[PDB]
Amino acid sequence: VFFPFWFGMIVGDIGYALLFYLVGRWLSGYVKRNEPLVIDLFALKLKPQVIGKLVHILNWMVFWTVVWGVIYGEFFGTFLEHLGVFGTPEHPGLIPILIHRIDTAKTANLLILLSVAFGVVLVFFGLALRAYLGLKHRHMAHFWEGVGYLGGLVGVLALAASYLGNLQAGWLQGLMYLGFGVFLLAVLMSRIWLMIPEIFTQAGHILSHIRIYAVGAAGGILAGLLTDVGFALAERLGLLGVLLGLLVAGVLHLLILLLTTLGHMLQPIRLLWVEFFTKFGFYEENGRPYRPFKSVR
Amino acid sequence: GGLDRGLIAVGMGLAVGLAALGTGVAQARIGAAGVGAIAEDRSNFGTALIFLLLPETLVIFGLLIAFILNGRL
Amino acid sequence: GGLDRGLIAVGMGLAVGLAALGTGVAQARIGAAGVGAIAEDRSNFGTALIFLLLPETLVIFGLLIAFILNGRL
Amino acid sequence: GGLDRGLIAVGMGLAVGLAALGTGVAQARIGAAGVGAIAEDRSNFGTALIFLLLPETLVIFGLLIAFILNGRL
Amino acid sequence: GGLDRGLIAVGMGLAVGLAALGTGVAQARIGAAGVGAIAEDRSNFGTALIFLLLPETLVIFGLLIAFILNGRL
Amino acid sequence: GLDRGLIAVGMGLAVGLAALGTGVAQARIGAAGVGAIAEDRSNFGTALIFLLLPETLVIFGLLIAFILNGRL
Amino acid sequence: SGGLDRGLIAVGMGLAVGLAALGTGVAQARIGAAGVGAIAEDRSNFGTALIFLLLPETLVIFGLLIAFILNGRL
Amino acid sequence: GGLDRGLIAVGMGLAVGLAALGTGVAQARIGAAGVGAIAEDRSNFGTALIFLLLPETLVIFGLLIAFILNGRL
Amino acid sequence: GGLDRGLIAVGMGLAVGLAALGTGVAQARIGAAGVGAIAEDRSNFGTALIFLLLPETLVIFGLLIAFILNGRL
Amino acid sequence: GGLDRGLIAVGMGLAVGLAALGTGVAQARIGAAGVGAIAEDRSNFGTALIFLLLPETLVIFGLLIAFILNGRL
Amino acid sequence: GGLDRGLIAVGMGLAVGLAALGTGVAQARIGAAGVGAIAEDRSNFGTALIFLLLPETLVIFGLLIAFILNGRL
Amino acid sequence: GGLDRGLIAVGMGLAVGLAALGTGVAQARIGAAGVGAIAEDRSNFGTALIFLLLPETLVIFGLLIAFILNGRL
Amino acid sequence: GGLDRGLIAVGMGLAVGLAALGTGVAQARIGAAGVGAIAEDRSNFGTALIFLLLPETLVIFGLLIAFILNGRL
Amino acid sequence: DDFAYLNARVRVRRGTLLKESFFQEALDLSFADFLRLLSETVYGGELAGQGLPDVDRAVLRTQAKLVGDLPRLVTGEAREAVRLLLLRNDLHNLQALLRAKATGRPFEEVLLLPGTLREEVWRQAYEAQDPAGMAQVLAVPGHPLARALRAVLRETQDLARVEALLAKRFFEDVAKAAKGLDQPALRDYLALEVDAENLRTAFKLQGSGLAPDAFFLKGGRFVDRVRFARLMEGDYAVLDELSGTPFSGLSGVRDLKALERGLRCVLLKEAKKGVQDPLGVGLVLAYVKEREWEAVRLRLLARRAYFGLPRAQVEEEVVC
């Protein structure tokens, strides 16, 4: 429900989506051929069922990067230059754009507020889920730690939005009352100490969701600047060395593709793995792995 | 604009870069010991990740001061 | 204003950034020893958390100084 | 009077370079332990690429502040 | 003024940040040996805490200088 | 015409300091790579890919430099 | 009644206190490391480890001396 | 107007010098491991030279930025 | 008066602080070896103190330079 | 002329000095391993001098930038 | 005549402090090996004191430059 | 009037001092390995002195830039 | 006029003190290995003193630059 | 050079060792189950056939393949700090070659288990007109034997007093080389080891009464000259005096067997502390000494399994 939708907000290029669709149709042809994938450079040998799962995650990811290439309005970086397919009022050629993402006076505050808002939803869902699991097993310290982090975090967020954000310091101060009262009540009815230094890192974990907009703007204007340099210095310098600039911008664009899509593919899943999974526990006593009677077949 | 707008921006960017240097210094040694403990066996993953990504509060604090200075102008 | 606010901004930014560098220097070695003690046995979790989260007193002091400087702005 | 654009640009460059130094300091030791786990057996591949690609948050946070500054430039 | 408050601010921030860096350098090695002595036994706990909390005399002196500068701000 | 130089010292500071960052990275990674190659020839491709991975630093530094050039 | 002196004496005081703080932090790092090692060996070298840890605080009381000298002649 | 040629020149010189510092820090340990490998055997000479001469990319990029600034001059 | 007083103040402060950093870097390793020699036997109390109080000639020279500049004030 | 000669000169001198620092850092470890390799046997003299006189490409690039800055003066 | 005596005073103080840092870096390792040789045997007192008192020539050179700058002042 | 000579002076002094720092960092480890090789045996003395005197090329290049900059004055 | 006479002093100081830092770094490891060689036996005395007294050529060149700078003014 | 690069490989290899339930269930079998249980683990990679020379050759070959690699793979300070762990083998080979040159039995006489030097040096280092030439061809640069044999070579060419002063010079030189650099977990270890060495030397030289201070060395901290003399002469309250030290349960011990058992246990205990430093040299120390403990315990269990000895003869020798 979350990770491909975040990766869409990372990668908003329709050309990246088309190249992913090409490698996905290649890889689904590879599971049609029923060959185990082998490469001795990485010593990667693996069975086609994992490769079919990779087909499934790649399709369910590439839909969201298509739709966030539409809303962010970027075709292969920026090929709206010749055909003005995306409508900004500085050069309105065709259908409008929802958010421009290349400038920051129009984009950055809204996108940064939504990027914090997803972390708000995620972390409050995680702490509510830890409180649920503490309510289940009749173990009370988990319930108190969950309600304490929830109250302290919403109190710090309300105090931040009031005394460092806008005006109207009247309504939210009762929410600050409630939040810090619940936090002190939890620490008193808990005796589960060293939660007090954790709430600063807890606000760190609700606030560290900036990185989706950060790598989104980074990769987006990096691709846009590369195709800008290539397209401009090819077209308006010579008019027939345009294939020279086009293919060198293409090969450098595929170079930065191959050199940082690993990193800004890894960023949403580490965001999940080190905020959401570690809020509700998940790191205690390792469970026990179910292995049946094999009959290896 | 004048000297005001110019100097608040370098007071922003120095804070961001230098807090990033701090958490790089931390995550260097913590990632070294983490890659070690994983390379022993694939069992310390849930503790290597939390001990590795405990120091990112520094750079979110740097971004907090940066956004305060951005809204300040 | 003028030269005033830019220079108080570089003051508060240098304070938070350099204190963040200080606690990154501390948490480097303390987190390395903590990952080592956890990879020895899983019963060192509370003491490694308390020693790794002790030197954030520096950065709450630094954020205190920066918020005092933003108040005197 | 004209002391705006150059000083916000040197704030931009200082943030980017200093955060770059931070994640270089991190990836140095993390990639060293990563190659030390790789060249023994090639089964620690993804669980070392995760730790190598993990500190790339720092330069993109510096680039975030840089692009905000370019928006104000 | 336009020059008094800014430069006493960068003095205050420089004092706080650089004292924080000093005691971070101290608490790095002292906390590493303290985590090690805890990993031996739980009978060296109080001495590890007193050697870790000794060098915050540095930063209470740093905040003393900072608040003398606030009193003469 | 007074701020035209300070954009360029910001450009040069970003380029040089990001070069310092990936030099610090490539120091230890290339030391481990030369150690692995001195062990056996069979770790060539992994040494090259781990050595060429931290060039993100300098290509982002060139991104900032070309931002500050395209402004001027 | 200066217009520039009041700030630059303050950055002088802050630089002296901060940089002497860094000096005794770099000293007390290795000295406290060897002290905690010797206390972890035996519970007998406590007074000598405290006197070697508290010996380089002469630097920071000298830094506070210079700071309050500049505060007096401000 | 003045005070532009000198400042683009100090940007040029700072870029070249600091990139030289970066590749010096790289080639220090890379050439140390290379001379160790050569002292072990003479068979691995060309791979030692190619890992030693990989970080010339740093300084040809630094000279690129320098000559872009000088063509701007 | 005017512009001289603050600049000789930062000269005195820089001299005292940086000489303090010098003798702190010296006393780090000298006191480490001295505490090791104490931990070997108790007949090194008469050599660790002389080798540890020898490098404060540095800071009495630094305070001499500070007081010469304070008299030149 | 005027003030710009001094600032192009400090850019030139900073380039020379900082590139010299870079190749001194680069030659330290290589010279140490080369003296060790000579201490093994006297057969590896030429490879030691070629690995030690490799990284002066840095300083001939620094002298190149310095002489071009002189050529623009 | 504005900033003249302040700037020559900060040159004097920077010279003394930075030479102090240099001989602190030298006396650190020299005093470490000296206290090691004393803790081995007592008869190495003269060689330890001659090797430790040899790098104070740097600070008497810094005091020479300081007294020449006081003479021109 | 003009401020040329002071700024070319700080460029000259910065170049010479920073080149001296770089070749000091080089000769540190080169002389450490050299004293090790000589204290092994005296059969490698000329090669030890030529490896130690090899980073004086840095110093004579830096002084060449210093005297070219003085001759520009 | 009243600043051109001033800036040469911080040039001279940042020459001499930083060259002193360079030769202190150069003397550190050589003095450590020399005290180790004397700790072997009291017969490798002349070679230890010649390797320690070699890198003061840096600071005599720094004082050469200092007295040439004083020869200008 | 880099400690973390070697430490990653050492932590990988420490991930693969033998557990306690292995020998606890191999404490009662009949040597075919021993061959069975060693057919699976990493020591079975070099097991050729079956029998005692096969098992011994397998253990020595796997230890040379799995332990003798880490003195390589680094260059400089890291190898200078890691080479001073597995260096007893070089002393044993050098004193065997020394007594073989001083005896006259042929150069192919000894078996020469691998230490840290390649064996071409050994093949070349028998023919030399000057034993200083033998130490010269033996000399790899920063080696302790390369600067110890020429140190105590300054009397004669080839004697046995030369060998005794070689052993004493080796111990004090390894302790001084531990003091001469910065590893906070190896200096204390080698001091405690050489304290154990001259303590058990004093125990195995009881009753003779010859001059003890010529045999006593310097480099330990828990013992001194007077405790060494009063331990060589027969009263053992001084051995009962050592409390607070890690010589904890070792009190009132007279015979050599229980003494050396307690010393080997306290060395493996204090050397298992090296996970305190997961970046420096402590972890490779805690790997190598745990590996040799596991190897010699595997060897003793092999002997019991083959010869059918009672488990009450072995139960005291797997106590740690």
- Map tokens 């042929």 to a residue: N106
Q: How many residues does chain M have?
A: 73
Cα dihedral K5, K6, K12, K16 sign: positive
Phi/psi region, residue N76 (left: phi>0; alpha: psi -120 to 50; beta: rest), is left
Interaxial angle between packed helices D5-38 and N3-15, expressed in degrees from 0 to 180 and rounded to the nearest 10: 40
Give CA–CA dist M25/K22, Å, rounded: 7
What is the Cα M29 distance to its own chain's centre? 14
| 3-state DSSP assignment of residue N46 | coil
Counts of helices then strands in chain G (DSSP H, E): 3, 0
Give CA–CA dist B35/D29, Å, rounded: 10
Cα–Cα distances in angstroms (integers) from residue A20 to residues A47, A222, L69, in the given order: 21, 19, 58
Residue environment code for N252-290, b if the CB has 16+ CB neighbours within 10 A, otherwise e: ebeeeeebebbbbbbbbebbbbbbbbbbbbbbbbbbbbb
Q: What tokens appear for H68 in the block?
A: 């872009």
Cα–Cα distances in angstroms (integers) from residue H46 to residues F34, F41, J50, in the given order: 11, 12, 13
Q: What is the CATH number of domain N76-181?
A: 1.20.1690.10
CB contact under 8 A, N141 and J33: no
Q: What tokens appear for I30 in the block?
A: 């000298």
The CA dihedral of H63, H68, H70, H71, to the nearest 10 degrees, is 140
CB contact under 8 A, L35 and M40: no
Of A153, A121, A130, the C-alpha closest to A6 is A121
Q: Which CATH class is domain N1-75+280-320?
A: mainly alpha
Residue C24 in contact with residue B55, Cβ under 8 Å?
Answer: yes
What is the Cα A89 distance to its own chain's centre? 29
Q: Could you tell me how many CB contacts below 8 A there are between chain H and chain J? A: 149
F44 touches chain A (CB under 8 A): no
Query: From the CA atom positions of chain F, what is the Rg in Å?
Result: 17
Instruction: Provide the experimental method for this PDB entry.
Output: cryo-EM
Give CA–CA dist M39/M27, Å, rounded: 18
Residue L26 in contact with residue J27, Cβ under 8 Å?
Answer: yes
To the nearest whole Å, the CA of K57 is away from the closest chain M CA by 9
CB contact under 8 A, C65 and E1: no
| 3-state DSSP assignment of residue A45 | strand
Give CA–CA dist A231/N316, Å, rounded: 81
Give CA–CA dist A207/B56, Å, rounded: 10
Phi/psi region, residue I16 (left: phi>0; alpha: psi -120 to 50; beta: rest), is alpha
Of H29, J14, M29, the C-alpha closest to L25 is M29
Q: Among partner residues I2, I12, I35, which is closest to G38 by beta-carbon distance?
A: I35
Q: What is the largest CA-CA distance in chain F?
A: 59
Cα–Cα distances in angstroms (integers) from residue A110 to residues A163, A164, C15, G3, in the given order: 20, 17, 29, 43
Q: Which of N79, N83, N140 to mutate to test the interface with J (most CBs of J within 10 A)?
A: N140
- Map tokens 């989706």 to a residue: A212
Cα–Cα distances in angstroms (integers) from residue B9 to residues A276, B23, N119, in the given order: 34, 21, 66
To the nearest whole Å, the CA of I4 is away from the closest chain G CA by 8
Phi/psi region, residue A34 (left: phi>0; alpha: psi -120 to 50; beta: rest), is left
**Cβ within 8 Å of residue A242, ≥6 positions away:** A234, A235
Q: How many CB atoms lie within 10 A of CB N184?
A: 21
User: Residue J49's closest chain L neighbor by CA?
Assistant: L51
End-to-end CA distance of chain E, in Å? Answer: 11
Q: Which CATH number fits domain K1-73: 1.20.20.10, 3.40.390.10, 3.40.630.30, 3.40.50.720?
A: 1.20.20.10
Q: What is the CATH number of domain N182-279?
A: 1.20.1690.10
CB-count burial class (<10 Å; 0-12, 13-18, 19+) for N41? middle
Cα–Cα distances in angstroms (integers) from residue M60 to residues A82, D10, M15, M16, M57, in the given order: 66, 37, 11, 9, 5
Q: What tokens appear for H73 in the block?
A: 């001059």
Residue F37 in contact with residue H39, Cβ under 8 Å?
Answer: no
CB contact under 8 A, K33 and M35: yes
Give CA–CA dist A37/A27, Å, rounded: 10
**Cβ within 8 Å of residue L46, ≥6 positions away:** none
Give CA–CA dist M71/M62, Å, rounded: 14
CB contact under 8 A, I39 and N221: yes
Q: What tokens appear for K43 in the block?
A: 């008869």
Give CA–CA dist N311/N304, Å, rounded: 8
Residue M69 in contact with residue L67, Cβ under 8 Å?
Answer: no
Q: What is the largest CA-CA distance in chain G?
A: 59
For residue M59, give the amino acid letter. V
CB-count burial class (<10 Å; 0-12, 13-18, 19+) for N46? middle
Q: How many CB atoms lie within 10 A of CB N227?
A: 17
Q: What is the DSSP string of chain M?
A: -TTHHHHHHHHHHHHHHHHHHHHHHHHHHHHHHHHHHHHH-TT-HHHHHHHHHGGGHHHHHHHHHHHHHHHH-
Cα dihedral N10, N16, N21, N25 sign: negative
Q: What tokens appear for A257 in the block?
A: 């593709």
List chains touching D (3+ CB pairs under 8 A). Answer: A, B, F, N
Give CA–CA dist N262/N252, Å, rounded: 12
Q: What are phi and psi of A38, to 5 degrees?
A: -130, 135
Give CA–CA dist C40/C35, Å, rounded: 9
User: Residue I34's closest chain K neighbor by CA?
Assistant: K35
Superfamily name and number for G1-74: F1F0 ATP synthase subunit C (1.20.20.10)
Residue H5 in contact with residue H73, Cβ under 8 Å?
Answer: yes
CB contact under 8 A, D30 and B25: no
CB-count burial class (<10 Å; 0-12, 13-18, 19+) for N316? exposed
User: Residue N191's closest chain I neighbor by CA?
Assistant: I40
List chains touching K (3+ CB pairs under 8 A). Answer: I, M, N
- Map tokens 């020595």 to a residue: N60
List chains touching F (3+ CB pairs under 8 A). Answer: A, D, H, N
Residue environment code for A151-171, b if the CB has 16+ CB neighbours within 10 A, otherwise e: bbbbbbbbbeebeeeeeeeee
Residues of E in contact with C62 (CB under 8 A): 16-17, 20
CB contact under 8 A, D37 and N6: no
Q: What tokens appear for L52 in the block?
A: 């130690």
The 3-state secondary structure of chain H reads CCCCHHHHHHHHHHHHHHHHHHHHHHHHHHHHHHHHHHHHCCCCHHHHHHHHCCCHHHHHHHHHHHHHHHHHC
In DSSP terms, A87 is beta-bridged to A96
- Map tokens 């050595």 to a residue: F51
Contact residues, K window 12-41, toward N, CB-based 8 Å cutoff: 33, 36, 40-41
Q: Which of D67, D68, D69 to mutate to test the interface with A (most CBs of A within 10 A)?
A: D67
Resolution in A: 3.2
Contact residues, B window 7-36, toward A, CB-based 8 Å cutoff: none
List chains touching L (3+ CB pairs under 8 A). Answer: J, M, N
Q: How many CB atoms lie within 10 A of CB K47?
A: 19
User: Residue I60's closest chain K neighbor by CA?
Assistant: K20
Element (H, E) at A269: helix A263-271
D70 touches chain A (CB under 8 A): yes
CB contact under 8 A, E39 and N277: no
Give CA–CA dist E66/G52, Å, rounded: 28
- Map tokens 């600039």 to a residue: A245
Q: Among partner residues M5, M44, M62, which is closest to L39 by beta-carbon distance?
A: M44
Which pairs with CB-CB distance under 8 Å and at least 24 residues apart come from N113-116? N113/N60, N113/N64, N113/N89, N114/N64, N114/N68, N114/N89, N115/N68, N115/N86, N115/N87, N115/N89, N115/N90, N116/N68, N116/N71, N116/N83, N116/N86, N116/N87, N116/N89, N116/N90
Q: Where are the domains of chain M?
A: 1-73
Q: Which of H27, H53, H54, H64 to mutate to test the interface with J (most CBs of J within 10 A)?
A: H27
List chains touching C (3+ CB pairs under 8 A). Answer: A, B, E, N
Residue A229 in contact with residue A249, Cβ under 8 Å?
Answer: yes
User: Residue F52's closest chain H neighbor by CA?
Assistant: H54
N/E touch flag: 3 or more CB pairs below 8 Å: yes
Residue G58 in contact with residue G8, Cβ under 8 Å?
Answer: no
Q: What tokens appear for E13 in the block?
A: 């921030």
Give CA–CA dist G36/N282, Å, rounded: 17
Q: Which residues of B touch D (CB under 8 A)?
A: 1-3, 5-7, 9-14, 16-18, 20-25, 27-29, 31-32, 34-36, 38-39, 42, 45, 52-53, 56, 59, 62-63, 66, 70, 73
CB contact under 8 A, E61 and G17: yes
The 3-state secondary structure of chain I reads CCCHHHHHHHHHHHHHHHHHHHHHHHHHHHHHHHHHHHHHCHHHHHHHHHHHHHHHHHHHHHHHHHHHHHHHC
Residue A210 in contact with residue D64, Cβ under 8 Å?
Answer: yes
Give CA–CA dist E25/G22, Å, rounded: 8
Interaxial angle between packed helices G58-72 and I57-72, expressed in degrees from 0 to 180 and rounded to the nearest 10: 0
In DSSP terms, A39 is beta-bridged to A44
- Map tokens 């920071």 to a residue: G60
Residue A125 in contact with residue A1, Cβ under 8 Å?
Answer: no
Of N309, N278, N203, the C-alpha closest to N10 is N278
Of N51, N58, N56, N18, the C-alpha closest to N307 is N51
Give CA–CA dist J67/I68, Å, rounded: 42
Q: What tokens appear for L37 in the block?
A: 């090789």
Q: Do domains N1-75+280-320 and N182-279 have the same CATH topology?
A: no
Residues of E in contact with C17 (CB under 8 A): 17
Residue K9 in contact with residue K66, Cβ under 8 Å?
Answer: no
Give CA–CA dist J41/C57, Å, rounded: 55
Element (H, E) at A46: strand A44-46
Cα–Cα distances in angstroms (integers) from residue J45 to residues H43, J48, N24, in the given order: 16, 5, 56
CATH topology (fold) of F1-72: F1FO ATP Synthase (1.20.20)
Of L25, F6, A177, the C-alpha closest to H6 is F6
Q: What tokens appear for A46 in the block?
A: 């693996």
Of A125, D69, K35, H15, the C-alpha closest to M32 is K35
Residue L23 in contact with residue M25, Cβ under 8 Å?
Answer: no
Residues of A in contact with F59 (CB under 8 A): 256, 259
